Amino acid sequence: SPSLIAKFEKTSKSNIEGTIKFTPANNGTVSVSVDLKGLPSDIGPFPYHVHEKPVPASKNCSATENHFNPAATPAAHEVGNLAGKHGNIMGESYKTEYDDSYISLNEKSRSYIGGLSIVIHANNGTRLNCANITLLDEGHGNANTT
Ligand SMILES: [Cu+]
């Protein structure tokens, strides 16, 4: 299944910028790479989750609606609750890599995260920035390059 990326951009609403990248891993897991800067540290730590609807053109993070949620152990967390399972983002800059065995890159899979969104929150729940989850590579198919 194809890899995905969420690209966060700085605006008057937020200085958070960088990427979260999702690549398929061998043992039924997805490799997640987070590379973010510009975080407002003193209002963190920062939960982040996959939400159920796209970020619209207005960049209103509230319009992504709720968590993609289709605890004392990782599987008991919401699927989209990346932060609950793997750690809140924290600091002014944050770079980390981990495997998640609950999200899916398979179009035909129920836990597919393509076409959804990620929201980064302040610790109090306020939504700070958000990005759509889109294809990481432009060229696909078994006779193509990229
Ligand atoms: Cu969220």
Curated annotation (Swiss-Prot):
Cofactor dependency: Cu cation
EC number in record: 1.15.1.1
Binding locations of Cu cation: 49, 51, 67, 121
Keywords, alphabetical: Antioxidant, Cell wall, Copper, Disulfide bond, Glycoprotein, GPI-anchor, Lipoprotein, Membrane, Metal-binding, Oxidoreductase, Secreted, Signal, Virulence
Changes after translation: The GPI-anchor is attached to the protein in the endoplasmic reticulum and serves to target the protein to the cell surface. There, the glucosamine-inositol phospholipid moiety is cleaved off and the GPI-modified mannoprotein is covalently attached via its lipidless GPI glycan remnant to the 1,6-beta-glucan of the outer cell wall layer.
Glycosylation (residues): 27, 60, 124, 132, 144
Effects seen without this gene: Leads to sensitivity to hydrogen peroxide when cells were grown in nutrient-limited conditions.
GO cellular component: cell surface; extracellular region; fungal-type cell wall; hyphal cell wall; side of membrane
Family: Belongs to the Cu-Zn superoxide dismutase family.
Protein name: Cell surface Cu-only superoxide dismutase 5
